[PDB]
Amino acid sequence: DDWSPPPIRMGVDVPDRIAGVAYPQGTTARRLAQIGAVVTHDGDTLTVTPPSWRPDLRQPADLVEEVLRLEGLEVIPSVLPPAP
Amino acid sequence: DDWSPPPIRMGVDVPDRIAGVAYPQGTTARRLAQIGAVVTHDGDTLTVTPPSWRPDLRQPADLVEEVLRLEGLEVIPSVLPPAP
Ligand SMILES: [Mg+2]
Ligand SMILES: [Mg+2]
């Protein structure tokens, strides 16, 4: 009687860290609700339940990709890493 | 009638940073007094007046060399810098 995939816990700033971009406040919750997920917010952790048409959303990295592609890859800066 | 060089202002933890070593508290003040300097404390800043037989002591780096050599170079660790 409920077709939603399991909930996913993710830090609120995790998309920001993976992108290397400080997104405006509330971007991650806004974007993940736009794609149809239920987002509850406790502390610095989001609990994110994907909608039934998104069985591909299973871990934080899946959620990160949603935020980043909607914000657009162009906002991600180009920074060479420090190789040892 | 006073042959001392001019005073030198140096932050108390400057030798530590140049060495890459956290020396026990008071090491710089103790070493600089051993070599004959007059040392006074003002916050994190030392005022160091070299003795008259040390005209080579003119800038903070000269004071750093005094601390590092008496503590011994063996304590300085070996850390490759991240090069860009
Ligand atoms: Mg994906
Ligand atoms: Mg010297």
Q: Are A4 and A49 in contact (CB under 8 A)?
A: yes
**Phi (first) and psi of residue A46, to 5 degrees:** -95, 140
What count of other Cβ atoms lies within 10 Å of the Cβ of residue B6? 7
Structural tokens at position B53: 């037989």
Q: What is the largest CA-CA distance in chain B?
A: 54
> Distance (Å) from the C-alpha of residue B63 to the closest C-alpha of chain A?
32
Q: What is the DSSP string of B27-49?
A: HHHHHHHHTT-EEEEETTEEEEE
CATH architecture of B8-71: 2-Layer Sandwich (3.30)
Q: Tell which CATH classification among 3.30.830.10, 3.30.56.10, 1.10.287.1080, 3.40.30.10 matches the domain A8-75.
A: 3.30.56.10
Q: What is the DSSP string of chain A?
A: ---PPPPEEEETTHHHHHHT--PPTTHHHHHHHHTT-EEEEETTEEEEE--TT-TT--SHHHHHHHHHHHH-GGGS--------
- Alpha-carbon Rg for chain A in angstroms: 14
Cα B45 to Cα B51: distance, rounded to the nearest angstrom: 19
Ligand 1 centre distance from Cα of residue B4 (Å): 72
Cβ within 8 Å, pair A82-B80:
no
Closest residue in B to A80 (Cα) is B84
How would you class B48 by CB atoms within 10 Å of its CB: exposed for 0-12, middle for 13-18, buried for 19 or more? buried
Residues B59, B65, B66, B68: is their CA dihedral positive or negative?
positive
Ligand 1 centre distance from Cα of residue B30 (Å): 61
Going from N- to C-terminal start, the domains of chain A cover 8-75
Cα B37 to Cα B24: distance, rounded to the nearest angstrom: 20
Closest C-alpha to B71, from B10, B8, B20, B5:
B20
Q: How far is CA A74 from CA A18, A32, A50, A69, B38, in A?
A: 14, 19, 26, 9, 59
Closest C-alpha to A50, from A65, A42, A39, A61:
A39
